[PDB]
Amino acid sequence: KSLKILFTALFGPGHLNACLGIGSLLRKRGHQIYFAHFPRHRATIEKHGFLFISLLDYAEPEFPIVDMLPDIGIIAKFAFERMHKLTPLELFRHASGKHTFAGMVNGSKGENYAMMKIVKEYKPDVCLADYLFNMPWMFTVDCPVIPVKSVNPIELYNGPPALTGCSIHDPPSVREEIEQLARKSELELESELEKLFAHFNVPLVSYNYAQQLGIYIYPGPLDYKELGSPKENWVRLDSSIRSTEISNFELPEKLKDKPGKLIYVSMGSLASAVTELLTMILTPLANSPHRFIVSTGPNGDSIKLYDNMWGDKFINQVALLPKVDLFITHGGSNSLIEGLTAGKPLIAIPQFGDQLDNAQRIADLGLGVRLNLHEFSGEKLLKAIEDVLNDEKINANVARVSEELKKSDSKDKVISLIEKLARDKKL
Numbered sequence: 001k002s003l004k005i006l007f008t009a010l011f012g013p014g015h016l017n018a019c020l021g022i023g024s025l026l027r028k029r030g031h032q033i034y035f036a037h038f039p040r041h042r043a044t045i046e047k048h049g050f051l052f053i054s055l056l057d058y059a060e061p062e063f064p065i066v067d068m069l070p071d072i073g074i075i076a077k078f079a080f081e082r083m084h085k086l087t088p089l090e091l092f093r094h095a096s097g098k099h100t101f102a103g104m105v106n107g108s109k110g111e112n113y114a115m116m117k118i119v120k121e122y123k124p125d126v127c128l129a130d131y132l133f134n135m136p137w138m139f140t141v142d143c144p145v146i147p148v149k150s151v152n153p154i155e156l157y158n159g160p161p162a163l164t165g166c167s168i169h170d171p172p173s174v175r176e177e178i179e180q181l182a183r184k185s186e187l188e189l190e191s192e193l194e195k196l197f198a199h200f201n202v203p204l205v206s207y208n209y210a211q212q213l214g215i216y217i218y219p220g221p222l223d224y225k226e227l228g229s230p231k232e233n234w235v236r237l238d239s240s241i242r243s244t245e246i247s248n249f250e251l252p253e254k255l256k257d258k259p260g261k262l263i264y265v266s267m268g269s270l271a272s273a274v275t276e277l278l279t280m281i282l283t284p285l286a287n288s289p290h291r292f293i294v295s296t297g298p299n300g301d302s303i304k305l306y307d308n309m310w311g312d313k314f315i316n317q318v319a320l321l322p323k324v325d326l327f328i329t330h331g332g333s334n335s336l337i338e339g340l341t342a343g344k345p346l347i348a349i350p351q352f353g354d355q356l357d358n359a360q361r362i363a364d365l366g367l368g369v370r371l372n373l374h375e376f377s378g379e380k381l382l383k384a385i386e387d388v389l390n391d392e393k394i395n396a397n398v399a400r401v402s403e404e405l406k407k408s409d410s411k412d413k414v415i416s417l418i419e420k421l422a423r424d425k426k427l
């Protein structure tokens, strides 16, 4: 009756958090949850009651593994400088067939060795893995393996190219070029995955193939129903929000009894490392007639806050969101779902990857506005705030999606499929 279930994910807290959500549902049904991740997440993993396994304890001498979270800013600073200078079209021309995350693929060999040893030792009944791309170990281990996807799922559909930020209102002419450039760089990803798979003598699969079951996490009302169905074996979970740390969130006395709406500002787990980005956003908000709670990121201690702002490096985002009126976000999927669950509209300033797809989805479906870094001004950000605060149509759309997310029973089907696959080893 009781299953051994092993989770893993890449370093990004977004990938871990999505998995923690599914791990909760499965623990409530009486299964033993294991989580293979990095020592900086042992505390949260063990607090949710999962057994913690360190990726670092299973490293191969010739393939060392490092947690890239303390040094992701270098990568995120490059994305910022480019997105600040270039339009999304100009950025794709420049990329010259270079894919957004093909550079990570060669570096994956170490984690792959580690997971082969970990799945052999712990002999689980099923594995789940939130990665940006399939990894050889998922096809060599005895048990079935369910890819979990927490990024924007447009990549699972035949439609606008992914990582591009295309609109449903975009004319065929503007879209023909971006489509062409994206197809060119998608094959750079395939060629890099070929080398990684060849390294382990495993036949190459599509980067987002699900052999039996795949779980993508996106709200039904935002899912791409106008493009048809996702790829085979891929099933939607409307949300995967981890257990709240504190149920009640005490507001800081600085922003209490002060004039204006209450606005949350975070640029995520990764982009938040770029102090120049937060500084660009916060400087003009000094003279926005409202109150800001700011996630300042790993370098937050060196970021100036003004009289209408309170902030810490890390914020309890899930506890906070119910108390705010508006969320200024980077376009991360967990932040999107956390925000819409709380019923808050979004101003999305996308930085890299699926964030552009999520930002354009927020715009296209009347759940907030997209603000591009190339066009960014204090004038346009302050107007975006006033427009979205006062737009009854947007605030109605968000409330509607909020209700669809609370009432969702998508979790019921998804739990059954995980249990069926784990016990039957097929669907």
Ligand SMILES: O=c1ccn([C@@H]2O[C@H](COP(=O)(O)OP(=O)(O)O)[C@@H](O)[C@H]2O)c(=O)[nH]1
Pocket: 012, 013, 014, 015, 017, 266, 267, 268, 269, 270, 271, 295, 313, 314, 315, 316, 317, 318, 331, 332, 333, 334, 335, 336, 338
């Ligand atoms: O101060 C903070 C900043 C972020 N987060 C969490 O970090 C995740 C960010 O995921 P998302 O996909 O939105 O961003 P990304 O991982 O792409 O940066 C979400 O679960 C947030 O709740 C948090 O708890 N506190």
Ligand SMILES: O=c1c(O)c(-c2ccc(O)cc2)oc2cc(O)cc(O)c12
Pocket: 012, 014, 068, 072, 075, 100, 101, 103, 104, 151, 270, 352, 353, 354
């Ligand atoms: O290009 C990259 C990228 O897009 C991402 C990413 C992480 C989490 C997401 O949710 C979405 C994207 O991580 C990276 C990590 C690296 O060490 C190097 C990279 O080049 C990327």
